[PDB]
Structures are given as structure tokens and as C-alpha cells.
């Protein structure tokens, strides 16, 4: 048909809208009903469209994704697992992005230089693994992974998977972009089918047009407060309505991005003119042109059934600000100054932070700049500390050139390197002592306890870049930009005008410096050296196969109460240093969870010694002595980041099973991949029958089966037994992973030995 290539860097890899079409057609013949946009792209990508059983919320689809993307903090373990497979070359276009390890301290060029020195060992291992398996590499300084994908790799109709939970960002350009763990991405780099449980679809209908201070971030801050952190679990969010055309392509990216915060498999928009415009301005005008010929399969079918519909009138929507320690606690900016005051949240703002993959684009930077020049016109500068992260080299080079970066500098801001930085806690914050209670306002997405500075008493509120700017100028949460009056230098009271700004540069985008490094697809005659005495990298040893027996007299390591995020299970910040060393990173296991016995973080009873101590050391002690253990958690366990370390670490320290009232998706998949047993209570009130002193026997593992529950004998210390039933979402493919000890031990048996 046409030969239009997937990117400027793979000129030989072509977009298959013909294959999409062929399979959407086979599927709609079988179903005879309207398909939504997400069903078309997803079902369009099935390995077997004539035979696949499709039932939303029930069947597991075996899919063929178009590309794989990884960032430096999760690419390490994903590549160390690819090296154990023993396969020579990745089978689909794959990329590594070096965005997570650049700590913020001094600002821009300085922080990058110091990071290239400190992280040389790791960046070197990724560059060599890259050259060898044929994975493209974006060097430190290039930008935050999702801004680089939308600028170079995302198009209408792509199915892209990535080792980072905010990969949905790509829905701003009409693809199905989905967050996964390192072992899922190894399957796809290895060329085997990827499985996804078939999603429900929540249609959200946008009406009106946004006006003034309201921006794209307010739509997803309000959707989050309406649907809550677990309302999107098992669903794709599918936007539609007349209001869509009012939103920029990067603002659509913004909204798809933070759908991660309601547990959604991903979010997506239909191909329209704002997207076409952006493809053309990022040199992919031929992809805009080919999407016009395929437009019917890149929009939803007339009258498709959504499993839930929600409607938002953009024109009625006001400025929002969410948190303190969950992103679905939504307030209007006009009332946050009084709830905080009622609730005891601190009112003076210490630091205001714009950036992250949710809000770091050319439009975000210019809208922020426009509040800042008004303050400058009255001789005012930031009363809070103000830091600014650009999303990529191209945005850094271009806002510099269009004058924005200098306006933001003149009000008192520091421009950091194009990296995550403060958002995964790679910040060297020294204005507060730890445990000092304070307020930081960000334009980020998560605001879980201790995540930006490892201080639990930091109250972080997430919002939009123009509201962060306005409030940093004011220095207080009691300030509504829309109503209130600042006082200039001159003695005159003035009020801020709502910001106006271009969505893309009028001129072309200045590209900045070279940051991409292509694989030699020639040479690749590299050796990947991992020093055997290294502290940051260590090769893997397989896990144990299942011994054919049931799990008797298991010890409860911890029974967790409340919210247990993957930032509570495996902390980030200073622990990023060890993302390539399983034994050294296993020392943060569960140190942030609250134990129900004492309401304390990292303080659990050792069953043997009866002394209370750290969770890592207690699990190593149990392991050392042959005690197999279990974790009992509450609802929506594993909320957050997709880091597979949160499942690798309990397996490394002797953990056998995890039993919760519900799981967040990616974490449940990550636990089955590593040989553990994620199990749910068939009755959630059974959580109250189990006490940390009891021993549990999981029985009937020998005739393990999809749909059939397993029985748990809660042995109470007094001799009382009790049976409860525990359900599991395993299909027979997954049961082969557990029997073998892990998906990777299974993939290695199938290589005929
Ligand atoms: S949420 Fe923060 S840490 Fe995660 S990719 Fe976005 S910017 Fe980096």
C-alpha cells in the first residue's frame, strides 16, 4: 500500500494501517455491533483475530505491539532479564531514555555534567546493551521519555508498551499506549504474544470549550476526584464530544497521562485536526496524510457502547488543585485556602515546581511565562522558590529562543535539566529539616507520602503550570488568581490577567543538540561488562521451580493497613542507584507500609526473637532460617508506578504469596511474572479474621485452575482452624509461570532444554 515509516530513525519500519483494517474487519464480522476507538486499535492488533474470544473484563487478549520504550531506571532490570533469555536481537523497534537519574541541585548544565560523571557505570551498561541487542538510545539530557515519544514515536493507531506507568501520555496522538513491567517488555522484545485482559471502556463526553484560567489539567483533576484512584481499574478511558476540538494536542496528552492516577489500562482521543497540526510541525506530515486516508478506523464507530459514560462541560469548569497525599482529593483553587486552614495543612508555599511528563510542553511553558511577565511589569518576583523543568531538548532550545526561559528566570526561577528530577525525588532539597511540615505545590501527577524529598510531612498539591506560577508569586494557598489582588512595587493594587499563549511555536521547533544514538546494525560485537564486585549492577540467578507441594505454615511478614502504593513497597529517590542490583535494592522492601499492629512504618515483630525491627532485615532473617512468608494487604494494593522491583524484591527475600482485598493491575501482573501468588479474598471481610500471629496454609495448588478458588487454612495460635476461599485471575499460560518459578524460567524451558 504506501511505505510511510514509523519514525525519522527507523526509515525501513512501516506503518501497517492495512493490517489494522484487515483485522478490525475480521473482528466486526464476528461481533456485529459498533466498536469503540480503543476496541478498534486493540482488536486491530490481535495475534489471532479469527479465533480470539473477546469478552470485555473477562478474556485475555494475545496482542502484537508495534514498539517497546524504556527509561534508564527500569531499563536496567529489563535488560538484565533480556540477557538471561540468551536471545541475540530485539524483535520490534525498542528505545532507552535516560531521564530518571539526573539529580537536581545546581540547575541545568551543571546538574547534567555531575550526573554524567556519577552515573557513568549505568549509562555505559545501557549504551552497550543498546548497541548489542539493537535498541536505540537517547542520552542524558535528551528529555523525559513521554515528551520524546510524543515528539518522535507516537502516531494514530499505534499500540506501544513502555516500562513506566505514565506511557498513556501517547493517547494525546491517538495510539493505545500502555504501561507494563520489565518482564512483559522482554516477552515482546523476544517476539512472543503479549497478553492483556480485555478492557471495559468508560466514555467521557466533553462539551463546551475551556476559557481563561481553566486548562487541560483541570479536566483530569476533576475526572480523578469524580472516579477516584480505583475507579478506572480494568478500563480504557475514551474521550469524545464537541469539546475535544477545543483542546491542544499536548493538552490531550496531559489528560491521557494522569488517567494513570485512576488505575486505567490507558486513555485515548480520536484523530482530529489538532493532532494533524502537531504531526506536521514535528516533521511527520506524511503520517498525518496517511492517517487522513485511514481516518475511519482512527475514530469510534457511530453509536458504540461505553460501559460507563461521564459528561463534563468545559465552559463551566473552574481551576482545580488536588491532594495533600492522594491525587483524587480534588478542591477548587478558589476554596483550597479555606479547607487547608480548616484541615491544618500549612498555608505558606515553600517551593513551586512546574514540569514532569504531565506538564512540561511548549504551551505549558508559555502559559506560565505569561503570568510571570505580568508580575515583572509591576516589579514583583516569586515569593516562593520556583523551579522549571523542560520536557525535552527541543522544548528547552525553543522556549529559550522564543524568550520564555528568560521571563521565568527574571521572576526568580531555576531552570533544571530535561529530566524527571524532583518528581521521582531526585532533588537535593535543603530548605526544610526532615519531619518539618511544609507545603510544596507542583504541576506533577502523584503526591504520595515522601515521594519528592523523602520527607513524610511535605504536603504536596498537584495543579496546572499557570496556577503554580501565580501561587509562587503570591507565596500562599490563600490566593485565588481569578479574584485577588497583588500589590506592585509602585503602591498600586493589580489583578492577574488569565494567561494566553501559542500551542506550538510559530516558527519551527529548534531541535537543540544531538542526543540520539542509533544501534550499529552492523558491529554489535560488544561485550557487556558487569563488574562482579559492583554495587549498582549484578547479574541474575533464576528462581526456584515449584516443588509440587502446597504452602503450609506460612508466616505473615506484615499485614498492611490502608494505602500501599509501589512507592510504599519499593521507594524511589536515593534507592534509584540500585535499580540494577536486586540484593542491594531489596533493602527498601515495604519500609513505607503501615503495620496494623502498631500503626508504624518499618517496625514489625520478628516471630522468633520477639523483638520489633525493620521489614527488610526481618524477611532476610526469615529467609536465612527457612521461614516462607506472606503479605496481607488492603484495597488497591500496588497502586502507582509500574516498577517490577516491587515484585522482584519479595521473591528475592523469601516471600511466597500476597493476599489483598483488591490489586492494581500492573502490580498483579508483575507478581505473577516473578513466580508469586497474588490472591484476593472471596469475601473482603475475611481480612478481619487474620491476625499477624497466625499461620496460613494455601491448599489445592496441585490442581490449580482458572476460575477454581484455592482454600486457606488460617491456623490460630490456640489450635482453632478456619478455612476461607481465595480467588485468583490466572489463566493456564500464567499457571505455567508459577509452576516454573517465573515467566523467564518458562521461556527458557521452551528453548528445547
Ligand atoms: S511521573 Fe515524574 S518520575 Fe514518572 S516519568 Fe513523569 S516526570 Fe519522570
Amino acid at each position: 500500500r504506501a511505505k510511510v515509516a514509523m519514525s525519522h530513525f527507523e526509515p525501513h519500519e512501516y506503518i501497517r494501517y492495512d493490517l489494522l483494517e484487515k483485522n478490525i474487519d475480521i473482528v466486526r464480522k464476528r461481533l456485529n455491533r459498533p466498536l469503540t476507538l480503543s476496541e478498534k486499535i486493540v482488536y486491530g492488533h490481535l495475534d489471532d483475530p479469527a479465533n480470539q474470544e473477546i469478552e470485555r473484563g473477562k478474556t485475555y487478549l494475545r496482542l502484537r505491539p508495534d514498539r517497546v520504550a524504556m527509561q534508564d531506571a527500569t531499563a536496567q532490570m529489563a535488560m538484565l532479564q533480556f540477557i538471561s533469555s540468551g536471545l541475540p536481537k530485539v524483535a520490534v523497534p525498542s528505545t532507552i531514555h535516560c531521564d530518571h537519574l539526573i539529580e537536581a541541585q545546581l540547575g541545568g548544565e551543571k546538574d547534567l555534567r555531575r550526573a554524567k560523571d556519577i552515573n557513568q557505570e549505568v549509562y555505559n551498561f545501557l549504551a552497550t546493551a543498546g548497541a548489542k541487542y539493537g535498541v536505540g538510545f537517547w542520552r542524558p539530557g535528551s528529555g523525559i521519555i513521554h515528551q520524546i515519544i510524543l515528539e518522535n514515536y507516537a502516531y494514530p493507531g499505534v499500540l506501544l508498551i513502555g516500562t513506566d506507568s505514565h506511557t498513556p501520555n501517547g493517547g494525546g496522538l491517538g495510539g493505545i499506549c500502555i504501561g507494563v513491567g520489565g518482564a512483559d517488555a522482554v516477552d515482546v522484545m523476544a517476539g512472543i504474544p503479549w497478553e492483556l485482559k480485555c478492557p471495559k471502556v468508560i466514555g467521557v463526553k466533553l462539551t463546551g470549550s475551556l476559557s481563561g484560567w481553566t486548562s487541560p489539567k483541570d479536566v483530569i483533576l476533576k475526572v480523578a476526584g469524580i472516579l477516584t484512584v480505583k475507579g478506572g481499574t480494568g478500563a480504557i478511558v475514551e474521550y469524545h464530544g464537541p469539546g475535544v476540538d477545543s483542546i491542544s494536542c499536548t493538552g490531550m496528552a496531559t489528560i491521557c497521562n494522569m488517567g494513570a492516577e485512576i488505575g486505567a489500562t490507558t486513555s485515548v482521543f480520536p484523530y482530529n485536526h489538532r493532532m494533524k497540526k502537531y504531526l506536521s510541525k514535528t516533521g511527520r506530515a506524511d503520517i498525518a496524510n496517511l492517517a487522513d486516508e485511514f481516518k475511519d478506523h482512527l475514530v469510534p464507530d457511530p453509536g458504540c457502547h461505553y460501559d460507563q459514560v461521564i459528561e463534563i462541560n468545559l465552559s463551566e469548569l473552574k481551576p482545580h488543585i488536588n491532594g495533600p497525599f492522594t491525587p483524587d482529593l480534588a478542591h477548587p483553587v478558589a476554596e483550597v485556602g479555606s479547607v487547608a486552614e480548616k484541615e491544618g495543612w500549612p498555608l505558606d508555599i515553600r517551593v513551586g515546581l512546574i514540569g514532569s511528563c504531565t506538564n512540561s510542553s511548549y504551551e505549558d511553558m508559555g502559559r506560565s511565562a505569561a503570568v510571570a511577565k505580568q508580575a515583572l511589569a509591576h516589579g514583583l518576583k516569586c515569593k516562593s522558590q520556583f523551579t522549571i523543568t523542560p520536557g525535552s531538548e527541543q522544548i528547552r532550545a525553543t522556549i529559550e529562543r522564543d524568550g520564555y526561559a528568560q521571563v521565568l528566570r527574571d521572576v526568580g526561577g531555576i531552570v533544571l535539566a530535561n529530566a524527571c528530577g524532583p518528581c521521582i525525588g531526585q532533588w537535593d532539597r535543603k530548605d526544610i529539616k526532615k519531619g518539618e511540615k511544609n507545603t510544596i505545590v507542583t504541576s506533577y501527577n502523584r503526591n504520595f507520602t515522601g515521594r519528592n524529598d523523602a520527607n513524610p510531612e511535605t504536603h504536596a498539591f498537584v495543579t496546572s503550570p499557570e496556577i503554580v506560577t501565580a501561587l509562587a508569586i503570591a507565596g500562599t494557598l490563600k490566593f485565588n488568581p481569578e479574584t485577588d489582588f497583588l500589590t506592585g512595587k509602585d503602591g498600586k493594587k493589580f489583578k492577574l490577567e488569565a494567561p494566553d499563549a501559542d500551542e506550538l511555536p510559530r516558527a519551527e521547533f529548534d531541535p537543540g543538540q544531538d542526543t540520539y544514538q542509533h544501534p550499529p546494525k552492523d558491529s554489535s560485537g560488544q561485550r557487556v561488562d558487569v563488574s562482579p564486585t559492583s554495587q549498582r549492577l549484578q547479574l541474575l540467578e533464576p528462581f526456584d521451580k515449584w516443588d509440587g507441594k502446597d504452602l503450609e505454615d506460612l508466616q505473615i511478614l506484615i499485614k498492611v493497613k490502608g494505602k500501599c502504593t509501589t512507592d510504599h513497597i519499593s521507594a524511589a529517590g536515593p534507592w534509584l542507584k540500585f535499580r540494577g542490583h536486586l540484593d542491594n535494592i531489596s533493602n527498601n522492601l515495604l519500609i513505607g507500609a503501615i503495620n496494623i499492629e502498631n500503626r508504624k512504618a518499618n517496625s514489625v515483630r520478628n516471630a522468633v526473637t520477639q523483638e520489633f525491627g525493620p521489614v527488610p532485615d526481618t524477611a532476610r532473617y526469615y529467609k536465612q532460617h527457612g521461614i516462607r512468608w506472606v503479605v496481607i494487604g488492603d484495597e488497591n494494593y500496588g497502586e502507582g508506578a509500574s516498577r517490577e522491583h516491587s515484585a522482584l524484591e519479595p521473591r528475592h527475600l523469601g516471600g511466597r504469596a500476597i493476599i489483598t482485598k483488591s490489586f492494581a493491575r500492573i502490580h498483579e501482573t508483575n507478581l505473577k511474572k516473578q513466580g508469586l501468588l497474588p490472591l484476593t479474598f472471596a469475601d473482603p471481610a475475611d481480612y478481619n479474621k487474620i491476625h499477624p500471629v497466625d499461620k496460613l496454609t494455601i491448599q489445592g495448588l496441585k490442581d490449580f485452575a482458572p476460575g477454581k478458588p484455592l482454600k486457606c487454612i488460617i491456623k490460630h495460635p490456640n489450635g482453632t482452624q478456619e478455612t476461607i476461599l481465595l480467588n485468583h485471575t490466572f489463566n493456564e499460560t500464567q499457571i505455567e509461570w508459577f509452576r516454573a518459578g517465573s515467566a523467564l524460567n518458562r521461556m527458557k524451558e521452551l528453548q528445547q532444554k
Side-chain angles (χ1 to χ4, degrees), residues 99-100 144-146 164 166 356-357 420 423-424 445 451:
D99 53 348
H100 281 50
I144 305 179
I145 170 177
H146 303 316
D164 190 85
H166 288 105
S356 78
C357 63
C420 302
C423 190
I424 1 113
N445 52 71
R451 194 195 142 93

Side-chain angles (χ1 to χ4, degrees), residues 389-438:
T389 312
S392 58
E393 197 25 43
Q394 184 158 98
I395 292 158
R396 179 202 71 63
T398 314
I399 58 161
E400 194 77 62
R401 187 248 274 161
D402 291 347
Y404 303 157
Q406 192 52 46
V407 179
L408 292 170
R409 276 172 220 121
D410 300 324
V411 258
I414 189 93
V415 177
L416 304 171
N418 319 326
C420 302
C423 190
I424 1 113
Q426 291 273 316
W427 180 18
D428 182 40
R429 162 111 119 135
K430 284 198 195 70
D431 60 315
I432 46 88
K433 78 109 175 76
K434 221 78 89 49
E436 203 197 316
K437 192 193 205 67
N438 73 307

Side-chain angles (χ1 to χ4, degrees), residues 561-576:
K561 170 222 117 280
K563 193 177 186 57
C564 202
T565 298
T566 50
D567 290 301
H568 285 84
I569 310 166
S570 165
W575 293 97
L576 294 179

